[PDB]
Design a binder for these strands. Structure first.
Lengths: 109, 94, 99, 97, 97, 80, 109, 99, 111, 107
DNA sequence: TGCACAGGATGTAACCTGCAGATACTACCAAAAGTGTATTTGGAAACTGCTCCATCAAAAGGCATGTTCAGCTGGATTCCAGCTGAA
């Protein structure tokens, strides 16, 4: 096994596994060679985007280890990730701090 | 005398030290700068500007410190940081 | 030692590698890693499902990088799609111009 | 007896422009340096001359900025410096925009 | 028909901020450059792109200076730029200073 | 055989417009000429210093690019 | 010449040329092998960032060919590129549209 | 045909290749390409110059990827530095794990 | 008969040998000609003499016999050319030149 | 032994050179009865090192721009004209030239 | 006196086309670049001398803080000569 397909694609995500999963997923009769490479790259990119943001969140909370809360903070404070995961629940994620203005002390202000 | 590991070891939490840059101190700096009258909002504005100035120089000085694998910021790390920001300082080496 | 060895794969070691490239000094809890595994599995399914329908709609029995690309454009929000597309196109080019 | 408003301020300008001593207290400045540095990287130590270098540079920077700020107040027909004067000087300097 | 004072000035600002063409005439600029250079070394020739580089740099410099000068005029509650505004900007920039 | 006077009031007004200026004092024009002459004297002096060092009789775009860079006014576009 | 160093690094920018330029630049007595690779990668990345943004600018202006104006628009509208090129002049770049509010019609508004 | 052939190299063909990876259907004028060549040359000089001083300050006669990395961190603004560092580290890793 | 430091040979006080070694140690070029460190040492010596001349004058003006940072700063800032050469340099413990803007002084005697 | 030592000489400190003795020599020429504090001397040492680096850097660039691998007194001279303001560059160039001419007049 | 409507002017749109300037193909070559092997050496390890950094202690007075009082500054308003914009 000279070079893995992931290495040839310059990827960290497993191209061969993605190829195999596409094939066993019954998505189509055939799967072209570039499909698992393109897809692995997208999966890796999205993972990097969320990890970057969750890592920033961990850092803002004085922590070095990303926990579910940080992933939730990262996704919910990001307009696009929030939309992509609009119908997803991150377990142990909690919610963003948010109090409707009218509820704050002194009538409404 | 060369034994330990911390042990007896200090270091209380540092916070709000920008307030250590007092109104009288800022008034004195403004006076050396030739300023005769100062609005009340100048003090917090000056603290904000100094904080940015310090953050920038210290950020580069520590980058030099870390690159050299040291844990101690040297006067040279500060001098080089100042120089790269176009604030060359004479009197501290280099 | 292969009996109860029914292999249960996940993206954990790959998610870990990416975390190192973006935040070298940051770790990730097991619960957080499971969230990430669910995330990658979810997006894989949505993109593959969209690619599947696209090919079927066009009477094609093959899912190629073109279907993945179009599925990405349909599924991901604006900026996320642009960069995902840019990354996908890059990996396929590299891979191609590769021994 | 009272000196008029401005008389003592002018006396202080003359006093401080003739001297060279640092004008911010030393220990308070040292804690600010340590606090800021700490936020960038924990566990740092400082040569004492590193802190004095930062203080010398910081004060020279502020004094020069107050000189530019004063020019800005005067430009607007005032003798009182205000935050907008500092902001204008930093913007023309390229520190802001 | 007459547009009010300021309406056409505003139209020109929008026109020129949208384009990138040099604003000083080529020949008069070339003459100035050659004249200045003759003071340092006689009988020089210039590559055409040398003159163009000088004009691109000179115009960018003046335009950016006018932006600063404009901020100084506005700081003084005026909308008209004056020599003292150019002078203040250059002093703060360290060009005069 | 004007010259600095050749940098016209209209060209200066145009420069000012690109700089966002709406109203201009009558004294701005001469002031601008003075400033522009100082800028060119400074840049051309250094460019010619590079020309002479090279033993050339022709000021090149590179001589100007190097002069601009050392004056803190790096210009892109002329390094061919 | 089996594989170029750029190919081995997964780069489009010329690693060998960068190595040679570092050596002829008198930056240091010696130049380690990974230095030109790291640097070539940074140069390529920055080029991609600006081309991406200038291409977007060309596109917003109804053009398919990037001209100096688009590079200027891209850099000046980008906080970080603007700072990196804070003391750089892009020839034929023009300036960003910007009129101080006080100058707009009806006193100041 | 080698006389007036004094080779004058530039990054034009490499900048062109990158433009294709990010904007396949976009071209670039000659004047714009010259701006890009100046850009790459400028950043190369600033990063190399910073790397040079770093090594000298530390009494090292070698500029390694570590000096390039630290120079990048000193020269580039926040986010730009993070991604530049991530790209640099990636190329050196690939290159290393390369035949 | 030949010799005698290169400094004596060039009629200088500053060290030609050291300047030559520093030029080689700094990676400025692959080669350094013999005359380069001589010329550079002469220039450094000349600038040093200029600043010291003016600084000693400042110390004398302030009735002092020992030059301190203040005197160097007064020498530099009161000299047009040295001020420009050192325009972006801070001399530690130098202070600033006495200078109050005109409009800030009192007058017209009266509220 | 090379780098020996370790009542004196605690494991030889690496020597930190400075221009101090030369600055001192020049001071005595111009102001025979004037001294200089160590802080002022530290300022002078920074000044000499800063100008050395500025001139050498300019000379380096000059040589590279001209595809020359040798920095000669000619590159130093041009770097001096580029770096120093008017009268200073004029007198500096004169002293530098005089020194090289003398230096080459020997042997 | 204020608000809204109507009218004339200006700018952009959609489209069309010549051409400056970008592009595709072939030919040639010095030097750019990579590979093989043989030698040199920078600088990391490892060990530890020796500096100077962090921190404690105690005393005390320079200086910060908080307040009172009111001088005179900045801010707001009004008026209009005449500079500067528009044509």
């Amino acid at each position: 096994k000279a070079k893995t397909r992931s290495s040839r694609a310059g990827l960290q995500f497993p191209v061969g596994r993605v190829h195999r999963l596409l094939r066993k997923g019954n998505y189509a009769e055939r799967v072209g060679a570039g499909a698992p490479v393109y897809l692995a790259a997208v999966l890796e990119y999205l993972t990097a985007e969320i990890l970057e943001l969750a890592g920033n969140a961990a850092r803002d909370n004085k922590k070095t280890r990303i926990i579910p809360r940080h992933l939730q903070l990262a996704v919910r404070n990001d307009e696009e990730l929030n939309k992509l995961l609009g119908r997803v629940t991150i377990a142990q994620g909690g919610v963003l701090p948010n109090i409707q203005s009218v509820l704050l002390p002194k009538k409404t202000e | 005398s060369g034994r330990g590991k911390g042990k007896k070891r200090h270091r209380k939490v540092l916070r709000d030290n920008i307030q250590g840059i007092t109104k009288p101190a800022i008034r004195r700096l403004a006076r050396r700068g030739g300023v005769k009258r100062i609005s009340g909002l100048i003090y917090e504005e000056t603290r904000g500007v100094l904080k940015v100035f310090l953050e920038n120089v210290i950020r580069d000085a520590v980058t030099y410190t870390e690159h050299a694998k040291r844990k101690t910021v040297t006067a040279m790390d500060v001098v080089y940081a100042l120089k790269r920001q176009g604030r060359t300082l004479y009197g501290f080496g280099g | 030692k292969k009996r109860r060895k029914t292999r249960k794969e996940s993206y954990a070691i790959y998610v870990y590698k990416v975390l190192k490239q973006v935040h070298p000094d940051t770790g990730i809890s097991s619960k957080a890693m499971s969230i990430m595994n669910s995330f990658v599995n979810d997006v894989f399914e949505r993109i593959a499902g969209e690619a599947s329908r696209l090919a079927h709609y066009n009477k094609r029995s093959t899912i190629t990088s073109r279907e993945i690309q179009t599925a990405v454009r349909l599924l991901l929000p604006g900026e996320l799609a642009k960069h995902a597309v840019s990354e996908g196109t890059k990996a396929v080019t590299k891979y191609t111009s590769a021994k | 007896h009272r000196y008029r408003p401005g008389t003592v301020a002018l006396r202080e300008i003359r006093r401080y422009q003739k001297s060279t001593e640092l004008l911010i207290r030393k220990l308070p400045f040292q804690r600010l340096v340590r606090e800021i540095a700490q936020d960038f990287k924990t566990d740092l130590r400082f040569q004492s001359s590193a802190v004095m270098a930062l203080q010398e540079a910081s004060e020279a920077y502020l004094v020069a900025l107050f000189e530019d700020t004063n020019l800005c107040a005067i430009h607007a027909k005032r003798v009182t410096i205000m935050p907008k004067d500092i902001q204008l000087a930093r913007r023309i300097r390229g520190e802001r925009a």
